[PDB]
Ligand binder design. Structure first.
Ligand code: CA
Length: 279
């Protein structure tokens, strides 16, 4: 399949070179997979989600996304126009309030929730979790992310936006999950992107167009935006039968565009998520 004039990030993920604008992907498009977006929620009624999105959990007085961040992230995972996996099922878990904040205890609870909750969902091709959030190092937070992964969910987490080594952030620093740095449309490491040995992969994170609340759209930047590209990619590859929750991060790294990014600090991987789709 080919989607012309796609957001640059989508085109980038299906290209061996920067500077193109068409997104190429197998029509299966993540059908039969599920992606949990653990964030400020998801505006499920957005036309862009086509009935494929649902809120399944909140720790606040509403499950509505009163911020937009979670809806943007979900849009990158699987919206019809702005999504990597255009046929995946999206499940929203609201661990962040409408200011985008959340206590670590609530974040942990949301991760453990998804590990159980996947047994209540129909996801024959497999399960992914996208965590576009983080804070300072916490062994408890890292352990929760490790549990979620161990339970059979492909966990993708943001490296963080401090232009700093991600070893000092959680869940970014957890070895067993897929930690995602951010790049721009010229294949530069995004100026704010964290880096370090704990990173597994980069995806598009600068000036990313996606869904927003009020049934709108916007371009924003962050490792928050890179993460759902990787989460969507994993879902898409799982439906194709190329990989599984346990091996998807390795598989993406194995099949990544290699050595193409600039300003990657010595010791950080130079790998950019790529779907290896031959139209
Ligand atoms: Ca890892």
């Amino acid at each position: 399949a080919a989607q012309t004039n796609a957001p640059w990030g989508l085109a980038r993920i299906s290209s061996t070179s920067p500077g193109t604008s068409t997104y190429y992907y197998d029509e299966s498009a993540g059908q039969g997979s599920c992606v949990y977006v653990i964030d400020t929620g998801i505006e499920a009624s957005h036309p862009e989600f086509e009935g494929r999105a649902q809120m399944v959990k909140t720790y606040y007085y509403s499950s509505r996304d009163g911020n937009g961040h979670g809806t943007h992230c979900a849009g990158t995972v699987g919206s019809r126009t702005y999504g990597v996996a255009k046929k995946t099922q999206l499940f929203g878990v609201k661990v962040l309030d409408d200011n985008g904040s959340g206590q670590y205890s609530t974040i942990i609870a949301g991760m453990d929730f998804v590990a159980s909750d996947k047994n209540n969902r129909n996801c024959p091709k497999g399960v992914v979790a996208s965590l576009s959030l983080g804070g300072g190092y916490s062994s408890s937070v890292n352990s929760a992310a490790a549990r979620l992964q161990s339970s059979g969910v492909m966990v993708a987490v943001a490296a963080g936006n401090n232009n700093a080594d991600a070893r000092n952030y959680s869940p970014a620093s957890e070895p067993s999950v897929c930690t995602v740095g951010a790049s721009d449309r010229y294949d530069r490491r995004s100026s704010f992107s964290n880096y370090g040995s704990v990173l597994d992969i980069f995806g598009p994170g600068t000036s990313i167009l996606s869904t927003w609340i009020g049934g709108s759209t916007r371009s924003i930047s962050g490792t928050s935006m890179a993460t759902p590209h990787v989460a969507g990619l994993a879902a898409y590859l799982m439906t194709l039968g190329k990989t599984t929750a346990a091996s998807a991060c390795r598989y993406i790294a194995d099949t990544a565009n290699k050595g193409d990014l600039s300003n990657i600090p010595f010791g950080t991987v130079n790998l950019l998520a790529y779907n290896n789709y031959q139209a």
